[PDB]
Amino acid sequence: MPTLLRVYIDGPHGMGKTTTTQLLVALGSRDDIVYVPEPMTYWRVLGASETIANIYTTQHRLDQGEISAGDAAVVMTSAQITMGMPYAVTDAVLAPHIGGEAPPPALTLIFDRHPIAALLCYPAARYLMGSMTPQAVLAFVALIPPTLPGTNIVLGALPEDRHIDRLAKRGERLDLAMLAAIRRVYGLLANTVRYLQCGGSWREDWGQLSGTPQSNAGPRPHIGDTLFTLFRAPELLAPNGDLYNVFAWALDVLAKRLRSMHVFILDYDQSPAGCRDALLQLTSGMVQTHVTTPGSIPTICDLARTFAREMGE
Amino acid sequence: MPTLLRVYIDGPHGMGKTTTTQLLVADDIVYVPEPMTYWRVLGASETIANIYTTQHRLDQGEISAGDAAVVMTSAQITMGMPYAVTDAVLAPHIGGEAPPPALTLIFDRHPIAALLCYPAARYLMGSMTPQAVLAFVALIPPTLPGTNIVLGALPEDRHIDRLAKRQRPGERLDLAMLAAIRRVYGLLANTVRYLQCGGSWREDWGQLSGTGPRPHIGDTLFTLFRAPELLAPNGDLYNVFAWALDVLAKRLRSMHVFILDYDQSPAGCRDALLQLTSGMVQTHVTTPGSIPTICDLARTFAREMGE
Numbered sequence: 001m002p003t004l005l006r007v008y009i010d011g012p013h014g015m016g017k018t019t020t021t022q023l024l025v026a027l028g029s030r031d032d033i034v035y036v037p038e039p040m041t042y043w044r045v046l047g048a049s050e051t052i053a054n055i056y057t058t059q060h061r062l063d064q065g066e067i068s069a070g071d072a073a074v075v076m077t078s079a080q081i082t083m084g085m086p087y088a089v090t091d092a093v094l095a096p097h098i099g100g101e102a103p104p105p106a107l108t109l110i111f112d113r114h115p116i117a118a119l120l121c122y123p124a125a126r127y128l129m130g131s132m133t134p135q136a137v138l139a140f141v142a143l144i145p146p147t148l149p150g151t152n153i154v155l156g157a158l159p160e161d162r163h164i165d166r167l168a169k170r171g172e173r174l175d176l177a178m179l180a181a182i183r184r185v186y187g188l189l190a191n192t193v194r195y196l197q198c199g200g201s202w203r204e205d206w207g208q209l210s211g212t213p214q215s216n217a218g219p220r221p222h223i224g225d226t227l228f229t230l231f232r233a234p235e236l237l238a239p240n241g242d243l244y245n246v247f248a249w250a251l252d253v254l255a256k257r258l259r260s261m262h263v264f265i266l267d268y269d270q271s272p273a274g275c276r277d278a279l280l281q282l283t284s285g286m287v288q289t290h291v292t293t294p295g296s297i298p299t300i301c302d303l304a305r306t307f308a309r310e311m312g313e
Numbered sequence: 314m315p316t317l318l319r320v321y322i323d324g325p326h327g328m329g330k331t332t333t334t335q336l337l338v339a340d341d342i343v344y345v346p347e348p349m350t351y352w353r354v355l356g357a358s359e360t361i362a363n364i365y366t367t368q369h370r371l372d373q374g375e376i377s378a379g380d381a382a383v384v385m386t387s388a389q390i391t392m393g394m395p396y397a398v399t400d401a402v403l404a405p406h407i408g409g410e411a412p413p414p415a416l417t418l419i420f421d422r423h424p425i426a427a428l429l430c431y432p433a434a435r436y437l438m439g440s441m442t443p444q445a446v447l448a449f450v451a452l453i454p455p456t457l458p459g460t461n462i463v464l465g466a467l468p469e470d471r472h473i474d475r476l477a478k479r480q481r482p483g484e485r486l487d488l489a490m491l492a493a494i495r496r497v498y499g500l501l502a503n504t505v506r507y508l509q510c511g512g513s514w515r516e517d518w519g520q521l522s523g524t525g526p527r528p529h530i531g532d533t534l535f536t537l538f539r540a541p542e543l544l545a546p547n548g549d550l551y552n553v554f555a556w557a558l559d560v561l562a563k564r565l566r567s568m569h570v571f572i573l574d575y576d577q578s579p580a581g582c583r584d585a586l587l588q589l590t591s592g593m594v595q596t597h598v599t600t601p602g603s604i605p606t607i608c609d610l611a612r613t614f615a616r617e618m619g620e
């Protein structure tokens with residue numbers, strides 16, 4: 001069977017991920033590498049109206065005390081469902097085609113983001129921003145789809161000062177607090193994958209939090225530097241101080257989904273061509289999979305092109 | 314490996330699903346009850362009250378369809394969390410299809426109640442967008458072997474009498490919602506048969522507009538998605554929504570549906586449910602320790618979230 005290479009470029013907005021991705025794709029044949037863009041049209045029109053504007057306006061109104069935390073949470077939660085729908089549905093139809101882990105791939109699919117961006121990362125950052133409840137973040141976590149073999153995720157690194165300078169270009173609003181929260185969440189994500197792959201057991205180390213980044217290299221991180229640290233919220237604890245079981249099971253799901261992912265870090269503090277070639281070099285050490293049927297390649301290729309045409313900006 | 318029989322008791326609220334299941338369970342059979350405590354306290358405060366109050370406010374014109382939908386959507390996430398997390402942790406223990414089972418797990422509802430049925434009913438009540446409904450559909454967990462779902466049958470008037478008796482804390486007696494949820498579950502049963510008999514929604518889609526043996530597509534859940542919000546200016550369904558329907562079809566086709574007549578006494582309902590198990594599909598578990606782990610999960614869920 002032909003082989004497939006799936007690469008999800010993710011991380012905070014504003015680093016140059018979208019450009020880097022298209023430049024990489026521009027290098028190959030329009031036949032053997034396909035780009036799956038951010039579903040901007042779904043967010044602005046198809047799924048709901050101007051969802052990005054809605055998210056930023058909602059946080060703004062909350063910050064100004066014009067609406068309550070409760071009002072903000074219902075709006076953010078619904079907005080986040082809209083944000084992740086194209087990702088979830090694409091993952092669901094792609095799933096049956098992915099075989100086991102496995103010369104160049106017959107096909108390379110480069111995605112602008114993985115489902116965890118909308119089902120975990122942005123929801124967790126909004127929780128830190130006070131516009132989402134930790135229970136809702138964990139409900140999204142419990143719904144993250146099974147991690148398919150060959151899930152390569154490239155997260156980005158960029159000094160905060162450079163990031164802030166880039167970000168400030170312009171339904172978005174310049175929110176440095178949100179920028180800090182999303183950078184922190186993705187940093188914790190990278191550490192969480194490393195923690196799990198180094199054999200870390202959150203249930204075994206939970207008590208190391210009580211007293212208040214590299215994804216594929218380095219020593220095992222402390223649990224306090226992983227995503228697990230975010231769920232020590234009073235809302236999630238029983239009178240006896242322990243986490244309610246319903247939430248503990250959601251963390252078990254988080255561990256299971258992230259532990260099998262192959263994570264890489266891309267340095268975005270360089271020119272667009274530099275980012276492209278650095279990613280290209282990284283792509284060499286990534287895991288390919290076989291596909292399940294002979295026609296899986298053309299089918300997958302058609303799905304990606306249809307997705308891009310219908311939902312890409 | 315030992316065998317497991319999973320039975321999900323589902324269908325419209327107010328038929329007596331909970332009462333009947335209880336009388337049924339009363340060591341080789343465990344009951345995962347309605348997670349009322351999660352709904353009223355752990356996940357959020359009085360979610361049921363929130364849901365019915367919101368619809369009521371919408372019906373009275375005190376809030377817009379838009380405001381209602383964001384509330385219903387967020388609330389449905391809270392409602393389905395216990396089912397979703399339970400399915401996710403149970404999944405790795407389920408093996409392939411397989412004497413009596415070593416363990417029989419009876420659940421008060423399946424994840425599709427909160428990720429498909431109630432959202433579809435609220436869409437019909439004007440309080441949820443169809444795009445949100447399809448977003449929940451896209452998140453329905455893969456259907457594992459041995460997914461036996463028991464749905465109920467009960468005449469409308471009788472159902473209304475029981476509904477009046479079975480109101481949950483914060484619930485408002487809403488006959489329009491009762492009709493909507495009864496319609497959705499009826500379409501659900503028809504949809505499973507439609508798919509099992511080879512129906513292809515893409516092939517029959519034209520029948521919704523252009524006017525073996527199986528139900529007409531117009532009598533399946535697919536008909537609900539001919540919603541204009543999901544269509545392009547030329548009337549074609551956007552691909553992103555067509556893909557969600559492809560997911561819907563894949564998830565539902567392999568479920569094994571059984572109809573329980575609730576139009577009888579609690580003891581009768583209980584016995585009928587027991588009668589239905591002979592045709593249910595059992596599976597093996599994946600590890601020697603799966604059974605004990607499953608039991609613990611079920612007991613812990615009940616103790617923590619059951620009423």
Ligand SMILES: Cc1cn([C@@]23C[C@H](O)[C@@H](CO)[C@@H]2C3)c(=O)[nH]c1=O
Pocket residue numbers: 013038052055080083084113117118119122123172
């Ligand atoms: C995936 C995803 C993105 N976003 C944001 C970040 C950026 O401003 C922009 C482009 O990614 C859009 C609003 C979000 O808020 N939630 C999400 O799940």
Ligand SMILES: Cc1cn([C@@]23C[C@H](O)[C@@H](CO)[C@@H]2C3)c(=O)[nH]c1=O
Pocket residue numbers: 326361364389392393422426427428431432481484
């Ligand atoms: C599963 C589920 C139930 N409900 C309702 C119907 C009944 O009033 C009660 C008991 O089932 C509770 C509020 C709902 O609204 N959404 C859902 O996903």
